[PDB]
Subunit: 162 residues, 3 copies
């Protein structure tokens, strides 16, 4: 009775819960783009890894339509999480604070049917709100285009525990 | 308890993990300085800091600077600007003042002379912390003639000394 | 008490093993590229950091030969790890599962001796098998080239504890 997760009984002694150390799950769900009046969505099947106090969302490559210079990519965790994971388990340790967390470069191929031109855009975790994770995608300039080829992207942040 | 050692701690009467170890948020409002090949400038930024388990994350926002070299150093002066009770020493890496190539990543920097930026794909990493100044190396990707630089948001992470 | 790593005796109390919190080592070893009939290898000296349930492999910049549009970059951990680290210490928590983990942008300079053109490629941890870590490198298009200039790249993933 004397132990509190992530401290746990490990082979009759005091150890660290294996579940805290590593948990794998999956999100089959919708990624939505919105920017300067452009809107579209695509389905992705993504692995999720939860390791110590961090969650990692491993988005695969996907194809979308036009994007703006700056815009938002939103992951809807309200549906699609593999049980027993719940929407609440994707809440950041900074809750619904607005942040600039895990900012990275992502190269997106812009085209209108032909050979894509790759733009180096800037992506970060901005805000989680009621199960929707909003990622800012901006910078790198733009070209006229009708289609976007997105790379595989890993999105990571510290996960709520209270 | 006298018989527990941080980060192990009393958590609602039992043996648990200190919440402060699991998540601690702070802020740095301070000076980022660029130096390369005789070029020198500085800019003030507001940045969230998140300490999670044995890692520190410094979430730099987008900022604008002046000319950069093919290779150069970006320095974050943590001697001042940290929100109390966080102290300069709390930013020291677990590798102390070793010279490293840690967390190497792509950073796209927009170079211009006032007009539309050309983005160069540069290579950034944590190289050395010394006396409260974190030095990041920024090199590669080639260059153009320019007088202004548009820097992306960049998250700087590394293992924190204990 | 009966303590189970990473829970350990510290200073007479129940604490967290310093070994679990931070360990620094090195891999001096052979990185091999394979793609579309192209094959070559390079030697690298890389720092390794193990921090909580993560390993970080800090590859330095290196020069290679021709790459394909898509290919594998493989790290041979069977030899080259600094004692007391062993090959098994590099096994992922997802063991030998095929994954798309830690996907990121990497800019590689392609040339035939002259001025490099930088391609934004997409790199991820794909599979560890019998001491060999296989990273996928694809996307971003290509040009005709005989030489590749690779940036410093840090690759990280959760490490097995079983
Ligand atoms: Mg293959």
């Amino acid at each position: 009775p004397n132990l509190r997760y992530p401290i746990a009984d490990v082979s009759g002694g005091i150890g660290m819960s294996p579940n805290y150390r590593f948990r794998q799950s999956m999100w089959i769900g919708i990624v939505s783009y919105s920017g300067s009046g452009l809107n579209w969505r695509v389905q992705v099947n993504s692995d999720i890894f939860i390791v110590n106090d961090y969650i990692h969302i491993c988005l695969p490559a996907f194809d979308g339509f036009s994007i703006a210079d700056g815009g938002d990519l939103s992951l809807n965790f309200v549906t699609g999480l593999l049980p027993p994971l719940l929407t609440g388990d994707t809440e950041p340790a900074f809750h619904n604070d607005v942040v600039t967390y895990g900012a990275q470069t992502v190269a997106i191929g812009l085209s209108s049917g032909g050979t894509p031109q790759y733009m180096s855009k800037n992506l970060w975790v901005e805000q989680w709100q009621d199960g929707v994770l909003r990622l800012r995608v901006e910078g790198g300039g733009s070209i006229t285009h009708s289609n976007s080829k997105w790379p595989a992207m890993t999105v990571s942040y510290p996960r709520s525990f209270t």
